[PDB]
Design a protein around this ligand. Structure first.
Ligand code: NA
Length: 224
């Protein structure tokens, strides 16, 4: 029971992470030690009234990403929705959906993302987002609804991961507030990386034990 999804929050240095059918709001504190928990672990169906009677309230969120303002896409197997998470309040709501990924993102039909996406994170460039499934990755634009490029292996677009455990998949991910940095997770490990849109680059060395560098997650992952 490790992190299966996360998205960056509009609120500075805050991020929501999803574990099983639960979630936690966190001040991850990118370049600082005061990495702390703000809310939860709490059940999605409890923290999000808009999802109480949904498949998401029942099983949780398995992949997601922030878009713009207080909104994020959340997934659960072949289904997804756009929600306004209403940071630090009662007022969350489902904006679009829930629909199938195939119906929310027509370009995914026939590809390996059709029935589920492993993880994702927002790019700093325009309205672009990167999504992962297996050892493949997608770069999309959510406003104009298209694949910016052909889907290809994670190593092709993210060479710094070749050799690492992320080569073959990501349980979860979210973008950092610090420019062009993202956080990736798989099992007990994570990695902070610096990416550059339209380019194939390293780097950020140090795949690390997540609990080793996230004081605030002890007692929370692994959730059993
Ligand atoms: Na996931």
């Amino acid at each position: 029971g490790y992190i299966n999804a996360a998205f960056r929050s509009s609120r500075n240095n805050e991020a929501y992470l999803f574990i099983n059918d639960k979630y936690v709001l966190l001040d991850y504190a990118p370049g600082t030690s005061n990495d702390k928990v703000l809310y939860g672990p709490s059940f999605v169906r409890d923290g999000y009234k808009s999802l109480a009677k949904t498949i998401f309230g029942t099983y949780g969120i398995d992949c997601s990403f922030d878009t713009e303002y207080n909104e994020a896409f959340i997934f659960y197997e072949n289904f997804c929705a756009r929600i306004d998470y209403a940071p630090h309040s009662d007022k969350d709501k489902i904006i679009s959906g829930p629909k199938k990924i195939a119906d929310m993102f027509p370009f995914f039909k026939g590809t390996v993302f059709e029935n589920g996406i492993d993880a994702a994170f927002r790019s700093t460039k325009g309205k672009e987002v990167y999504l992962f499934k297996g050892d493949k990755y997608a770069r999309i634009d959510y406003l104009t609804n298209r694949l910016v490029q052909n889907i290809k292996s994670i190593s092709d677009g993210f060479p710094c991961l070749r050799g690492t455990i992320f080569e073959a998949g990501m349980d979860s991910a979210f973008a950092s507030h610090k420019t062009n940095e993202a956080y990736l997770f798989k099992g007990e490990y994570y990695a902070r990386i610096n990416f550059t849109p339209g380019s194939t680059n390293d780097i950020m060395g140090g795949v690390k034990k997540t609990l080793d560098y996230w004081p605030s997650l002890r007692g929370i992952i692994p959730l059993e």
